[PDB]
Amino acid sequence: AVDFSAHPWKAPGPNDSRGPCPGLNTLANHGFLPRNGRNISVPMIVKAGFEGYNVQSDILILAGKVGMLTSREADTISLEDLKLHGTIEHDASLSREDVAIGDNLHFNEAIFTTLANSNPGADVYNISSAAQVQHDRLADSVARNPNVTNTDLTATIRSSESAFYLTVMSAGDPLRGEAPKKFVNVFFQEERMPIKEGWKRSTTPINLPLLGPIIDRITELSDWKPTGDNCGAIVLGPGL
- Binding residues (CB under 6 A) for ligand NAG: these are 100, 119, 121-122, 126-129, 146-147
Specify whether the CB–CB gap between 96 and 111 falls below 8 A.
yes
Question: Can residue 89 be called a binding residue for ligand HEM (CB under 6 A)?
Answer: yes
**Binding residues for ligand 9IR restricted to 81-140, rule: CB under 6 A:** 88
Question: Can residue 34 be called a binding residue for a second copy (CB under 8 A)?
Answer: no
Question: Can residue 171 be called a binding residue for a second copy (CB under 8 A)?
Answer: no
Question: Can residue 158 be called a binding residue for Mg ion (CB under 5 A)?
Answer: no
In this chain, which of 29, 129, 160, 162 binds ligand 9IR, going by CB under 6 A?
A: 160
- The whole-angstrom separation of Cα 162 and Cα 205 is 17
Rg for the chain (alpha carbons), in Å?
17
In this chain, which of 75, 123, 173, 220 binds a second copy, going by CB under 8 A?
A: 75
Q: Which of 218, 188, 194 is nearest to 94 (CA)?
A: 188
- The whole-angstrom separation of Cα 158 and Cα 222 is 11
Question: Can residue 205 be called a binding residue for a second copy (CB under 8 A)?
Answer: no
Query: Treating both helix axes as pointing N-terminal to C-terminal, what angle do 22-29 and 152-168 enclose, rounded to 10 degrees?
Result: 40
| Nearest distance, CB of residue 178 and ligand NAG, angstroms | 6
DSSP single-letter state for residue 4 = G
Query: Of the ranges 111-119, 170-178, 213-221, 225-233, which one interacts with a second copy (CB under 8 A)?
Result: 225-233
**Binding residues for ligand HEM restricted to 15-44, rule: CB under 6 A:** 20-24
Strand partners, 179: 125
